[PDB]
């Protein structure tokens, strides 16, 4: 009789960028997941350890299409290793947000970590701006000359291939 604001998790005006994720906790909620399962607006709905027809930490962010497969246990890559590492039980749900996020001239409100000192631990969220040292000498505040600013932006735009489409990803961990 009391369904929680899944709509706030999914129908967000803005989504978090990887690097700066929106972590929401759901408690005291009817687990009516037929609402996500039977919805044709979603593409990926990959459930891990749980049947999708029977199915909480809701972690939301925007990722580019080639990297969608990285939001899974056992994966490697720029996102899986330096932004969001997953260990898990629950489902990864995603949808194509090109008509919402891809702005003319490019939507540059999303940022991801490219350079990192070490591989992330599961659910570690490193939100710092600390300079990557490269390894030949300490940077000492120097700009990125064989020294690197840790993150690169990623613009989304109306003309793109599949891997370049933005996706809104919500990970529902049980």
């Amino acid at each position, epitope marked *: 009789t009391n369904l929680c604001p899944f709509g706030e998790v999914f129908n967000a005006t803005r989504f978090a960028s990887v690097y700066a994720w929106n972590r929401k906790r759901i408690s005291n909620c009817v687990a009516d997941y037929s609402v996500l399962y039977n919805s044709a607006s979603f593409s990926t709905f990959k459930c891990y350890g749980v049947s999708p027809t029977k199915l909480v930490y809701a972690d939301s962010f925007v990722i580019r299409g080639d990297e969608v497969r990285q939001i899974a246990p056992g994966q490697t890559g720029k996102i899986a290793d330096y932004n969001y590492k997953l260990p898990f039980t629950g489902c990864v749900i995603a949808w194509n947000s090109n008509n919402l996020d891809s702005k003319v001239g490019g939507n540059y409100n999303y940022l991801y970590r490219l350079f990192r000192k070490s591989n992330l631990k599961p659910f570690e969220r490193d939100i710092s701006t600390e300079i990557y040292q490269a390894g030949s000498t300490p940077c000492n505040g120097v700009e990125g000359f064989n020294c*690197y600013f840790p993150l690169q932006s990623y613009g989304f735009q109306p003309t793109n291939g599949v891997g370049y489409q933005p996706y809104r990803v919500v990970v529902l961990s049980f």
Partner: antibody, heavy 124, light 107 residues
Framework: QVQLVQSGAEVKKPGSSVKVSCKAS????????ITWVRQAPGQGLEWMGG????????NYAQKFQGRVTITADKSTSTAYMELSSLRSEDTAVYYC??????????????????WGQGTLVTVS | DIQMTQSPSSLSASVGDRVTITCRAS??????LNWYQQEAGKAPKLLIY???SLQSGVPSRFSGSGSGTDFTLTISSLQPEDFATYYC?????????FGQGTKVDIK
């Protein structure tokens, strides 16, 4: 499409201060960097300093440390610089650029594409 | 800091000729050299970055090669729109280093 738009000429005399700015379009305001360079009439072009707004601390050349403040406003998406204790030798055209970089593998290369117009300051 | 040496300081040429400009650093920096063109009354614009790629869309008027401490820029066939000054920047330090600059002159 980070077009920069900057202010026009200023004439405040030695002993006061001059504040200039460049408004940025496009996006990714918070990273890469806002840098300022200057050149005297006669292209003795030099870097003064710059800032990465997401960090907000800047990095300055030894010629302007304690003289020039470089900052940025994320909500205004604007580059700012102010020179204090003005001198006649400071006459120059001041410019903004974004320190755009391209990254691949483990290396990034930096150059300036989005140059502003140049702000002429003649304190005399 | 990085000492950016740019020479010849004067390169006259005719339209259709070739122009060769040297940009050598005292330091061995593998690929951070950029070339800029500055037209009268205007802010400078980038021609070549990271030693050899073009940014401006110029129809192959400018190109060059070299690495580490050295580099050479060539103008493939000089045009009227190119009678502008040029300079090198080596993007490998804080402060960034600029050379003294050069110019292509006319007959």
């Amino acid at each position: 499409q980070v077009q920069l738009v900057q202010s026009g000429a200023e004439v405040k005399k030695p002993g006061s201060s001059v504040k200039v700015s460049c408004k940025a379009s496009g996006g990714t305001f918070s990273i890469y960097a806002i840098t300022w360079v200057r050149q005297a009439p006669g292209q003795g072009l030099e870097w003064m300093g710059g800032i990465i707004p997401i960090i907000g601390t800047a990095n300055y050349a030894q010629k302007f440390q304690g003289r020039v403040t470089i900052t940025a406003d994320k909500s205004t998406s604007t580059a700012y610089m102010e020179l204090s204790s003005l001198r006649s030798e400071d006459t120059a055209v001041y410019y903004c650029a974004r320190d755009f970089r391209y990254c691949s593998s483990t290396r990034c290369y930096f150059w300036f594409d989005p140059w502003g117009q140049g702000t002429l300051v003649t304190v005399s | 800091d990085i000492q950016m040496t740019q020479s010849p300081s004067s390169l006259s040429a005719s339209v259709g000729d070739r122009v060769t400009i040297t940009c050598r650093a005292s330091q061995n920096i593998s690929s951070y050299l950029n070339w800029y063109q500055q037209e009268a009354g205007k802010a400078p614009k980038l021609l070549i970055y990271a030693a050899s790629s073009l940014q401006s869309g110029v129809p192959s008027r400018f190109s060059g090669s070299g690495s580490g401490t050295d580099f050479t820029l060539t103008i493939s066939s000089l045009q009227p729109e190119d009678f502008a000054t040029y300079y090198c920047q080596q993007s490998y330090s804080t402060p960034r280093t600029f050379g003294q600059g050069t110019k292509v002159d006319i007959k």
